[PDB]
Symmetry: D2
């Protein structure tokens, strides 16, 4: 009933949840390379859920890339960052659910982790 | 040696120093009151040097008040916040040298403090 | 949704929402002072809904203030800030719903506003 | 700074500069690959001045990598992010002066640039 991975994104310039920011989730392989894990556009309210399956999202290193640049390039603003990425290692270690947050601005971005534990 | 108290502001939209920002400083009189301590404007580098010396800067709660509204407003952007503040106690756990840094954005902002003992 | 003013606080140290952080919303009266408006403390989720009804939240400037001082202090960390204040004008025009978010850290905080609207 | 790439890393939990934060700067390649551009750590000023020269800092896509995991780890704290990366294209205007800041906390970091001009 709940997926671990989820992204939220806000736009600090117009007090708005950034919509349609492109999200790409990359999972670290055995050899030490990256393969695609999930992909999607931020919905109309900032959130992007139903990204992975509560069982496909297994232990490992991850990297969420939010294409922040085309987002700002779309409204007349040339951004600093080429994009924004978030590397963490989700795990079966517990604290099984995660939501990544973004506070996007032309020359600055804060990223927030928020892990939770369901009822075991 | 360094400034017992300083302020620096940034522009998350232009990727640059917040220039010419009014900064008022008030000190709480032990009875509730807030009396004028100092004030000034952020120079080109975004900083604001000289707010007080150690002799003046005393143990007690203070309040920095950067007028974020007049700033964006002078550009054409109607910001959310009326102004911005940082309320804190100083010199109580010892006379230190503070630095209140602030990141501005029309609908969002951040302040951070670096507490530094003098060169002693 | 069916709530005009909500506040969502997060805890950057713990990686979970800042639970039981006492909020105190004031409303500037016509005389110029701050008459009590709403007042609660973060529910487990780190948020607050029933602060006011969609009719009580009239056009005017407001002051939301979070007691970070006691939050951090109940965990043993002596924060820098005395509290966290966000005065904004809720000129109930294009947008009726407001969401004041804030990320806490012992020496740094970040507020942001998200003003959606009664869409359809 | 009078040299091209200067990096500044503070601490939201200790309100102090972040010293010994290993920093690596890469450079995209003609093959879209990533050629190794720089290495260094943050001094006691939680600032790293000692990387490139205007002469050597050409136009291109960079990726500054801040080893946040080792930082939080040495202190006993257990972080979420593995690294903090600032990927930006540079000098596509005639080589300017860059400054990257990073505010650190275990479950959320924040980066911002300040594009300066030596002549202008």
């Amino acid at each position: 009933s709940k997926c671990p991975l989820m992204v939220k994104v806000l736009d600090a310039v117009r007090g708005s949840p950034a919509v349609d920011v492109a999200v790409k989730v990359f999972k670290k392989t055995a050899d030490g390379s990256w393969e695609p894990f999930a992909s999607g556009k931020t919905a109309e309210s900032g959130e992007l859920h139903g990204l992975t399956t509560d069982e496909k999202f297994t232990e490992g290193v991850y990297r969420v890339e939010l294409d922040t640049k085309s987002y700002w390039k779309a409204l007349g603003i040339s951004p600093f960052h080429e994009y924004a990425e978030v590397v963490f290692t989700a795990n079966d270690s517990g604290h099984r659910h995660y939501t990544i947050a973004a506070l996007l601005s032309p020359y600055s971005y804060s990223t927030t982790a928020v892990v939770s534990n369901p009822q075991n």
